[PDB]
Design a binder for this molecule. Structure first.
Ligand code: SF4
Lengths: 67, 241
């Protein structure tokens, strides 16, 4: 019965029946990432903030004298 | 259509009365045995194999013949004398059925030496049967011959019981496919299994007589069947590609 389904003309043995299924490619699939993959120093952040605030305070002093 | 035993014909037979069925040749030799004595009759052949026997030699034989002979005679003696030997010489022999059609065949190696006897063909995996000798030579397709025997047993089934009635046609279909080589290699083992399913499982002995020639063909010529399957793909697989 299975010979009626998968067998081909001139098949000599039942062990010669083809199998074509969903299969990985030869060599398999390539590897993948599994695990988790990953700022500025606080001195640098505080220095930039101090520079901006110092410029602001200088401008405040200048506009106060003009007023 | 045969009855099941028990009852037995000597207990309940024809018209419900005690009855014995005997062969013509069994009946006919009895007056000569009674007149000439039992010691004269038992002086021929081996022990438990006494007396004389009519032999019919047919097939590929130079002088086919119905001839009377002593029992326990060799096949080669019985064929070379009284029948002129095998057509083309003894080396042209392929196979011989020694006991009609219901017994398995024998190849050339067993035949050279075996005695035509009840207790000698049985040990050679055959039987004396009716002592009807059928000779085939090397020009014979032995699968075709046993296929025609399978056709005979399909045609002669009375159809009463399930294994004989359904399986003789199945054996004939499988053998017809095997003759052309349109089969698989494991279908030979399937064929042996189907003969073992028929044999010993029926009402009468025609089922056994239908299984036995195929068993002998498989046993002594499985290589021929395998070669017939393999070489058929030299004319069937050229169209598949
Ligand atoms: S074995 Fe065949 S012939 Fe004998 S009783 Fe069964 S069917 Fe009929």
């Amino acid at each position: 019965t299975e010979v009626l389904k998968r067998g081909f003309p001139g098949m000599k043995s039942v062990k010669d029946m083809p199998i074509v299924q969903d299969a990985p490619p030869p060599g398999g699939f390539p590897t993948i990432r599994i695990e988790r993959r990953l700022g500025p120093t606080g001195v640098a952040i505080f220095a930039g903030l101090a520079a901006i605030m110092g410029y602001g305070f200088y401008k405040l002093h200048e506009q106060r004298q003009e007023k | 259509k045969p009855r099941l035993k028990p009852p037995f014909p000597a207990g309940v037979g024809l018209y419900g009365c005690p009855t014995t069925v005997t062969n013509v040749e069994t009946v006919a030799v009895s007056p000569t045995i009674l007149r000439r004595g039992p010691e004269w009759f038992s002086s021929f052949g081996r022990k438990n194999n006494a007396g004389t026997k009519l032999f019919c030699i047919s097939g590929h034989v130079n002088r086919p013949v119905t001839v009377e002979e002593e029992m326990s005679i060799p096949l080669k003696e019985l064929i070379e004398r009284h029948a002129g030997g095998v057509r083309g010489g003894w080396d042209n022999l392929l196979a011989i059925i020694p006991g009609g059609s219901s017994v398995p065949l024998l190849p050339k190696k067993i035949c050279d030496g075996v005695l035509m006897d009840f207790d000698a063909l049985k040990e050679a995996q055959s039987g004396l049967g009716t002592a009807a000798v059928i000779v085939m030579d090397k020009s014979t397709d032995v699968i075709d011959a046993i296929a025609r025997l399978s056709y005979f047993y399909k045609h002669e089934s009375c159809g009463q019981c399930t294994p004989c009635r359904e399986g003789t046609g199945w054996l004939y279909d499988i053998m017809t496919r095997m003759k052309k080589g349109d089969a698989r290699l494991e279908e030979i083992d399937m064929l042996w299994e189907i003969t073992k399913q028929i044999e010993g499982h029926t009402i009468c002995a025609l089922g056994d007589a239908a299984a036995w020639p195929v068993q002998g063909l498989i046993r002594h010529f499985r290589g021929e069947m395998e070669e017939r399957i393999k070489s058929a793909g030299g004319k069937k697989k050229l169209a598949a590609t």
